[PDB]
Amino acid sequence: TTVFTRILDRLLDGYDNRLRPGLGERVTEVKTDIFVTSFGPVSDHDMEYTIDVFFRQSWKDERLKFKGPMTVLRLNNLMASKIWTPDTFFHNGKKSVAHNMTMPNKLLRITEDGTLLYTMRLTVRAECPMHLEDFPMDAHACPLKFGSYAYTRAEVVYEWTREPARSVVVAEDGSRLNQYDLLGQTVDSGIVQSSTGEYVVMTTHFHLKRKIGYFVIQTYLPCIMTVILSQVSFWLNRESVPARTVFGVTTVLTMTTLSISARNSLPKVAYATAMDWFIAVCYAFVFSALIEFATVNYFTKRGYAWDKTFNSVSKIDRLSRIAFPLLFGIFNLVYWATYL
Amino acid sequence: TTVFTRILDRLLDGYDNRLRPGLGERVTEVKTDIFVTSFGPVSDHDMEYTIDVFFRQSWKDERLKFKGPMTVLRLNNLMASKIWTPDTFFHNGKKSVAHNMTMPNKLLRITEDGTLLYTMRLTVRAECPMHLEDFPMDAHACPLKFGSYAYTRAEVVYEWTREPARSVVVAEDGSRLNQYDLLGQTVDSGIVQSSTGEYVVMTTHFHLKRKIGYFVIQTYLPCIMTVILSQVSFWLNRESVPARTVFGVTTVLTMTTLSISARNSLPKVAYATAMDWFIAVCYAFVFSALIEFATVNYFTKRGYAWDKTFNSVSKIDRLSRIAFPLLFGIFNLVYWATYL
Amino acid sequence: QVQLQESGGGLVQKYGSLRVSCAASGRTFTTYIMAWFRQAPGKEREFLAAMDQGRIQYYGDSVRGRFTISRDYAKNSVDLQLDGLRPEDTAVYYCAAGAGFWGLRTASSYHYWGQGTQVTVSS
Amino acid sequence: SFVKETVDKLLKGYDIRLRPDFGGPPVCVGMNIDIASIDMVSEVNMDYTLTMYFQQYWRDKRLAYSGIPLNLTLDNRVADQLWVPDTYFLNDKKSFVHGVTVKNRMIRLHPDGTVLYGLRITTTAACMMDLRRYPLDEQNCTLEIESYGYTTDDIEFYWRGGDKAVTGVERIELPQFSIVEHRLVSRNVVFATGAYPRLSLSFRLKRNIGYFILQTYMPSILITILSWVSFWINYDASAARVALGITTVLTMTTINTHLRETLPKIPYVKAIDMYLMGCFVFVFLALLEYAFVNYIFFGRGPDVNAIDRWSRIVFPFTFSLFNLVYWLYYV
Amino acid sequence: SFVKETVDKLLKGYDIRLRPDFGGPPVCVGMNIDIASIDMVSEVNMDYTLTMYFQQYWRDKRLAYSGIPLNLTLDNRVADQLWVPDTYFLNDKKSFVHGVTVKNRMIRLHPDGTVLYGLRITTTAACMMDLRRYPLDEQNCTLEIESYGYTTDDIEFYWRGGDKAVTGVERIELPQFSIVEHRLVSRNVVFATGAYPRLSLSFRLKRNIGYFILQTYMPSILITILSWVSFWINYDASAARVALGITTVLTMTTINTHLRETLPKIPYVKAIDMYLMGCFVFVFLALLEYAFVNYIFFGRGPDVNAIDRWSRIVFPFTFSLFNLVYWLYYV
Amino acid sequence: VTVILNNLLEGYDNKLRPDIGVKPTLIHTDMYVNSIGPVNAINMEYTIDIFFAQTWYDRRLKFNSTIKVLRLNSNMVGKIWIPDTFFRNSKKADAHWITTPNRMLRIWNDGRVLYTLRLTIDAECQLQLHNFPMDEHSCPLEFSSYGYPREEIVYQWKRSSVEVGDTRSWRLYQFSFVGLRNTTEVVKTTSGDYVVMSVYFDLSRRMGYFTIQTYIPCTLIVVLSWVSFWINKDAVPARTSLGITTVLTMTTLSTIARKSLPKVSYVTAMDLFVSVCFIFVFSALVEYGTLHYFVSNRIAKMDSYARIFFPTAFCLFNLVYWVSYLYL
Ligand SMILES: *[C@@H]1O[C@H](CO)[C@@H](O[C@@H]2O[C@H](CO)[C@@H](O[C@@H]3O[C@H](CO[C@H]4O[C@H](CO[C@H]5O[C@H](CO)[C@@H](O)[C@H](O)[C@@H]5O)[C@@H](O)[C@H](O[C@H]5O[C@H](CO)[C@@H](O)[C@H](O)[C@@H]5O)[C@@H]4O)[C@@H](O)[C@H](O[C@H]4O[C@H](CO)[C@@H](O)[C@H](O)[C@@H]4O[C@H]4O[C@H](CO)[C@@H](O)[C@H](O)[C@@H]4O[C@H]4O[C@H](CO)[C@@H](O)[C@H](O)[C@@H]4O)[C@@H]3O)[C@H](O)[C@H]2NC(C)=O)[C@H](O)[C@H]1NC(C)=O
Ligand SMILES: CCCCCCCC(=O)OC[C@H](COP(=O)(O)O[C@@H]1[C@H](O)[C@H](O)[C@@H](OP(=O)(O)O)[C@H](OP(=O)(O)O)[C@H]1O)OC(=O)CCCCCCC
Ligand SMILES: CCCCCCCC(=O)OC[C@H](COP(=O)(O)O[C@@H]1[C@H](O)[C@H](O)[C@@H](OP(=O)(O)O)[C@H](OP(=O)(O)O)[C@H]1O)OC(=O)CCCCCCC
Ligand SMILES: CCOC(=O)c1cncn1[C@H](C)c1ccccc1
Ligand SMILES: CCOC(=O)c1cncn1[C@H](C)c1ccccc1
Ligand SMILES: *[C@@H]1O[C@H](CO)[C@@H](O)[C@H](O)[C@H]1NC(C)=O
Ligand SMILES: [Cl-]
Ligand SMILES: [Cl-]
Ligand SMILES: [Cl-]
Secondary structure, eight states, rough: HHHHHHHHHHHHTTTTTTTTTTTTTOOEEEEEEEEEEEEEEETTTTEEEEEEEEEEEEEEOOOOOSSSSSSEEEEEEGGGGSSOOOOOOEBBBSSSSOOOOOOOOOEEEEEESSSEEEEEEEEEEEEEEOOOOTSOOEEEEEEEEESSSOOOOOEEEEEESSSSSSSSEOTOOBOOOEEEEEEEEEEEEEEEETEEEEEEEEEEEEEEEEEHHIIIIIIIIHHHHHHHHHTTTSSTTTHHHHHHHHHHHHHHHHHHHHHHHTTTSSOOOOHHHHHHHHHHHEEEHHHHHHHHHHHHHOOOOOOOOOOOOOOOOOOHHHHHHHHHHHHHHHOOOOOOOOHH | OHHHHHHHHHHHEEEEETTTTTTTHHHEEEEEEEEEEEEEOOETTTTTEEEEEEEEEEEEEEGGGSSSSEEEEEEEEGGGGGGOOEEEEEEEEEEEEEEESSSEEEEEEETSSSEEEEEEEEEEEEEOOOOTTTTTTTTEEEEEEEEEESSSSSTTEEEEEHHHHHEEOTTTTOOOOOSEEEEEEEEEEEEEEEEEEEEEEEEEEEEEEEEOOOHHIIIHHHHHHHHHHHHHGSSSSTOHHHHHHHHHHHHHHHHHHHHHHHHTTTTSSSSOOOOHHHHHHHHHHHHHHHHHHHHHHHOOSSSSOOOOOOOOHHHHHHHHOOOOOOHHHHHHHHHHHOOO | OOEEEEOEEEEEETTEEEEEEEEEESSOSSSEEEEEEEEESSOOOOOEEETTTOEEEEEEEETTOOOEEEEEEETEEEEEESOOOGGGGEEEEEEEEOOOTOOOOSGGGGEEEEOOOEEEEEE | HHHHHHHHHHTTTTTSSOTTTSSSSOEEEEEEEEEEEEEEEEEETTTEEEEEEEEEEEEEGGGOSSSSOOOOOGGGGGGSSSOOOOOOETTEEEEOOOBBSSOSEEEEOTTSEEEEEEEEEEEEEEOOOOTTTSOOEEEEEEEEEEESSSTTTTTTETTGGGGEEOOGGGOOOOSSSEEEEEEEEEEEEEETTEEEEEEEEEEEEESHHHHHIIIIHHHHHHHHHHGGGGGGTTTTTTTHHHHHHHHHHHHHHHHHHHHHHHOOOSSSOOOOHHHHHHHHHHHHHHHHHHHHHHHHIIOOOOOHHHHHHHHHHHHHHHHHHHHHHHHHHHH | OOHHHHHHHTTTOOOTTTTTHHHHHOEEEEEEEEEEEEEEEETTEEEEEEEEEEEEEOOGGGGGSOOOEEEOEEGGGGGGGGGGEEEEEEEEEEEOOOOSSSSSEEEEEEHHHHEEEEEEEEEEEEEEEEEETTTSOEEEEEEEEEEESOOOTTTEEEEGGGGGSSSSSOOOOOOEEEEEEEEEEEEEEEEEEEEEEEEEEEEEEEEEEEHHIIIIIIHHHHHHHHHTTGSSSSSOOHHHHHHHHHHHHHHHHHHHHHHTTTSOOSSSOHHHHHHHHHHHHHHHHHHHHHHHHHHHHHHHHOOOOHHHHHHHHHHHHHHHHHHHHHHHHOO | OOOHHHHHTTTOOTSSSSTTTOOOEHHHEEEEEEEEEEETTTTEEEEEEEEEEEEEEEEEGOOSSSOOOEEEEEGGGGGGOOOOOTTEEEEEEEEESSSSOOEEEEEEETEEEEEEEEEEEEEOOOOOOTTTTOOOOEEEEEESSSOOOOTEEEEEEEEEEEEEEEESSSSSSSEEEEEEEEEEEEEETEEEEEEEEEEEEEEEETHHHHIIIIIHHHHHHHHHGGGGGGGGGGGGGHHHHHHHHHHHHHHHHHHHTTTTTTOOOSHHHHHHHHHHHHHHHHHHHHHHHHHHHHHHOOOGGGHHHHHHHHHHHHHHHHHHHHHHHOOO
């Protein structure tokens, strides 16, 4: 086994890991691919998402050529710290983890020609600026940008290993998404100009579509049932002032409870979302059903109900039994067609 | 700068940082000094407070005497790890932070005579045992104790740099308190005894008084208005049984909600606070108002109101309009005289 | 209402330098991707350049290294510097803004479009 | 190989414990910041989180090299072998340098000896906010940059590029705040251990009111309006008018309770508190108005309709007048 | 004295960068796990926390020693000088080796060259849960054990002890779950960089129903039963029957609100949602039944009692039938 | 003293325990409990801050000199052999590092070594929450060597083994510390038999918080539903609104009672009380619904009976409930 020990000692003899390969001679070309083991949950409140990847980088270092019984050295990852590696970082990363349980989750393989393969297991939290105007029927393109921290494009360039569409692969059953659907991803590469120079940036946009099922169950269905309940009052006799006032005030309190609690998981945006409009309109219908009874009660003459002369069924009530359900159905037709 | 490199090399040659200065000849005297850059928030749930300080320590080490051009060597903090420093720890500290951004927040200055200045930037989280009997009108004396972990008072003694009052300084605009006022601090020193010997302890007591404004706004004022609301029913006619039942029930349920939420700001201690008694008495007033109506309804003979004989105005209602507001006003004066 | 107004253009001699600027109003596009497209006569819209909130520049292959895209985030504007112009570059240049859903190079991902500036190179 | 020999000679005999010009004039350090994002502006914790690219420039003559017309961008581990300023943030509470895939740090040397040293830092800095006008308040959050152990005789800070030393503010988009301006301040701070150079980066934040209109102001306005409906109901409908009056009182409590749970326990009155108290008084007085009407007819009868008709004007007029004084004072 | 020279000899010339039999056959690593505790099985975070004693067994002939009939237990810091397998957990989100009073690590050598390597690990492992039958659901949370850098040509995994490799499962006590069984799986996974050995430890968790009966099911049942009291109230009492009906509607809302605050935002209907929706419909229809009774008497009067008698039977019969189908389907 | 320290470490090997291959290394442990922190019922754990002291003999550290004891800081700790003591039921545990490592090392001339460090331990305590909130627990703290079996390391309690402070600065808000006991046993693992040292802390819950939070509010609502028995039965909206809103509030109160507990699937004492209060308020509404039905359409004297039966039954339940859970 001392043959392979002597090969490693020769490689590291007089080797400077402070210098990128080809420094002052050529541009270091780094080929990258990403295997997404899990696309983690998306946090709307923080406008961030989590992704777990195998981040693979490959480049050629002529100082690491060797001859031996094997053509590839599948080495302990501690060998990585003794050689030069790319200083890749994620531009939109917030707080990432390079896993090291039970050992640093890194592999290093050296081919005899001097090509290096260097992969690591990462958990990246990345910024995804969301536009929530169409929430909860919104779609987002969450980016994942990475590149060199220190080396400009005249020094280090990044490329995708295979075709860009094939250089980012997501595992078949690795979705940790709860309320989003990963429709697909687009792979690109660009250039960023900063105060320190011009840098290659490799981008991947993950296209996410929110699932509406949770908000139908917990927001849209309760709102609709509160509107339907508020219109049950129209079918009670006008001499039921306490009963029809309870209908009006409880549904208004219910809509207020729904309204202030529907944005609890969202960032406090200044603009109004699609769900805000639906709740505001449902509030108007519920508010108008209590104003309607006030008008009916104002034209009630006698304080006794039908068992002398008796009150008549209100014309306002007769038309409200039709107009209110009809206009709420029309709103739902326009609302859902506008956003779906 | 080769002159100063030799001086530092000469000083560290043969220097044993495992041994305290003057070992076997004298007690090592450490003069301490605390500058509070911010008195951070006080946590009632954990009974702890945060504090950001410049912790300054000074002592003499004859092994570090030097002669040269500069009388004081203002060195990189990396030098501090090569020499002996006091092993000061906070006795009541819980989880403190030594700041490491962008470098270790430390300084080390060596004068030519061997005197050392050693300051570090810390965030100390210390236990502050609180007696919450008078909450929210309570005051506390939060301590800050520190001393040597390993060296007994026969080896290392601590002293305040100046007069003890002037040795702890709080910055003019550093208060991070929301619910408290910092009324001043008491500085003291003492000796603690343990199984491993006697140790010098340096104590500071920050005196804090709770600001009552939040609890007046959010607890006392809603309690007072609920009691006033419950006494409104005394002025309604005795035949409005549903109306007066709604007054009694809703105010009792409001007091029930207030009593639950008034404990959420505090650790779940087993005794009653001063706010518990106010809510308990307010509950008694609100509950008696509903019991008063039940008595009035018991002596109501007719189900119809005045427009045939008619019910008279209840004597209980006539007396309750005076007794209930008066007794509550008397209780408020006695309550706020006791605690304020 | 949201409006995007291209400026510059007209006629330029071969090899001339032209700067095309777009002014946006009615909505702040700081978090959006502001792009440039061109449409040769009898041809589909061709992606030219884009620049997202992070100042990352994307380019089409035919214009990479020739055209430069910059953004004035304070002025809510995007500019496209045209250099090495050739008669093949004569088209209508469009300013666009969008969230880049299903790709920032596809024209269907941009919801806001300018009217269009004619750029012509005469040889 | 020439570069490798050059770097070894630079680091051979280099003393990291000594600053450049250790016994001479102070080393001038130029700083610029590229702000990547501001987030987590919290009133509960009284802090904001800032991600930035923190660049420091200084000239260390011990690192001057000749023969190479290149700027030597080295591996970031060489920073541990060089002297760097002991720069720190005074109001920083929790800060980390990003470390994926490697430590987000850069060292770039120049032939004359200039060192460019960059760090990608996320820091949570304390920002004590005055919330008396909340949610119509303007906050001022600062970042205090100081040398820890070097006084003004050893080190000098300056903003490299003047007023253009900080970039990226125009690209920041806060969901709840708008940045009005940022300033760069250079000054000295004196402690008991000496005078130290300080650089200040302050932002002025204006809170967006749109969220609070839908969340607290509009439900309070509509509930206050709804309590006037009782003025149009007959006096003898005690059950209906008490139910309406008490429900509007209960509704105002729910609005405040939800708002209270999202805020730090502050001892003073905020602007939004003043509005909810105002709306509560109007809702409370409408309920007390019926009790007055009920007492006059039943407890004193042995004009009732005048009081209700009078209230139909005064309550809408006084509440609109209250909104006039409120919004003129705070907007 | 002799033991020191033997250990000194083993570490002399040792190459930690090379695995045992580096150029030869794969090294077989045997694993057994002693589970200390499972806790925080989180539906919200979709994960669970595991504390275990993780032992790895392999032979390194470079560490063979003779003359000492002892199994040499060394200080745990010797693990930094010896080669250990690069074992990782694929579905691991956050993990640490305990470090009080020292790093909770064991290295025991054997004369034939066998190394026993123990670690005390707490790991938060991902477990995506299907909540469609919640709270009557069963979950299968797994632990994926794999080598990171070494393909099946370099390393082999096996459960040391077969079905007895994992111990301590029967002693685990989860408040909300019962561990029905656990399984051990050995297989190979292929990635683009090669084929890697994988060991899988999976538990089958059955959620306890007793908590949810007192928490949500009983108040739903008692609220539905009390909504039938209105059918026995005289049709004249509009204010009594409306207040009873509306309050039962609001109780079901509070029950669901308390429930959903403790759960993630999943886009499908759970079993508990199916029950709460059913109870709401019954409570909603009881209130609609009075409006129908009120409308028929007053809106068509110019058999009201028969509707109440019909409702007194049909509502208890349909609800008891709804519970019968619900529980037989899910239990 | 520099000469003594240099010679002690010359030829020293910290990877080998003293008397390896000769006899077990006997370690005498000592614990000063600085504070027993909060008891978290949901996570089934408690916090404890200790000064953990360990004493053993290392013949490689004998020295002949005028000085009798070397008193050293934490610098020397990493250079000599140290026991690999770990805490078996510790979910989280940290040492202390401000301003320096909170560690002390003392070496006597006959080779005796005293090693002490400060620890904060989050220890797992599986609480059995039957009889809650009138429950008592013995929360353990177990430690042993990670890799050295009984044939190599033995622990032994000293004369004054576990010491507590004033027990008044402790963060025991809901529990009162009543006492402790220390045990020693042998535990067989797959890698050998280990000496395990256990400290049990007996904790009895203070029900003062729960009386204010759950018992008194629930009782007042039960009393509230009895007010309807005195209201005239012709007031149908009054009796019904009182009856059903009282039931609605019990539903809210039941949820608040269990917010501080793990979601255990057995019935605690507090669950039994809240459930019985629910049955009382449920019956008060059914009582009126029965009376209202039979009067509009002796039984008519149901209100008189309910005025006596309901207060008497609830007092009777309270008599049995508090006697069973406090005395029985
Ligand atoms: C995955 O990756 C992560 C990230 O890399 C790994 O986490 C790292 O783990 C390693 C190994 O455990 C740590 O190194 C040792 O750390 C200890 C403890 O101090 C560190 O941690 C404290 C908090 O604990 C945190 O980590 C521990 C685990 O380490 C964990 O249990 C706990 O829950 C918590 O998470 C920090 O407070 C502390 O910071 C403080 O001290 C810093 C300097 O140390 C200072 O910069 C800070 O500002 C702050 O004040 C620190 O981060 C260290 O004590 C230890 O260093 C001693 O031991 C090593 C052993 O090999 C030795 O080589 C060192 O030289 C040193 O020993 C000297 O000092 C001893 C104490 O005085 C003395 O007894 C010795 O004799 C020796 O003295 C010699 O040198 C001195 C000085 O030159 C000289 O005067 C003497 O004469 C003599 O020559 C190690 O640094 C990392 O800290 C930790 N990093 C992070 C970010 O977490 C994780 O382990 C990886 N996981 C896996 C599975 O691989
Ligand atoms: C939303 C609020 C809208 C407010 C609109 C307010 C519009 C408005 O001004 O209404 C007044 C009037 C009230 O009608 P309503 O049926 O409620 O009241 C009857 C009406 O006052 C008759 O004139 C009375 O008869 P008479 O002459 O004394 O013999 C009759 O008394 P009696 O016979 O029982 O003794 C009353 O019951 O309504 C309309 O004319 C239809 C409006 C349809 C509006 C439809 C809107 C959808
Ligand atoms: C929580 C308070 C509990 C108080 C419990 C107090 C219980 C208690 O003592 O009740 C008796 C009485 C009820 O007074 P109240 O006026 O309500 O009842 C009248 C009384 O019953 C007369 O006797 C009736 O006339 P008559 O004889 O048939 O001609 C009259 O009938 P009518 O004219 O309508 O036909 C009834 O209305 O109260 C007091 O005298 C003042 C007590 C003040 C007590 C202190 C109050 C602060
Ligand atoms: C007719 C269906 O509507 C409802 O069940 C409904 C409407 N508002 C509230 N609810 C109930 C309480 C519910 C909401 C969400 C999940 C489960 C149950
Ligand atoms: C007369 C003032 O009383 C009130 O405003 C009052 C009393 N009970 C409740 N409230 C309201 C809801 C309130 C409390 C606290 C802050 C803002 C608003
Ligand atoms: C418990 O500690 C005492 C000293 O306080 C000791 O005498 C006794 O032996 C210990 N018990 C056990 C079982 O170790
Ligand atoms: Cl998600
Ligand atoms: Cl505070
Ligand atoms: Cl406790």
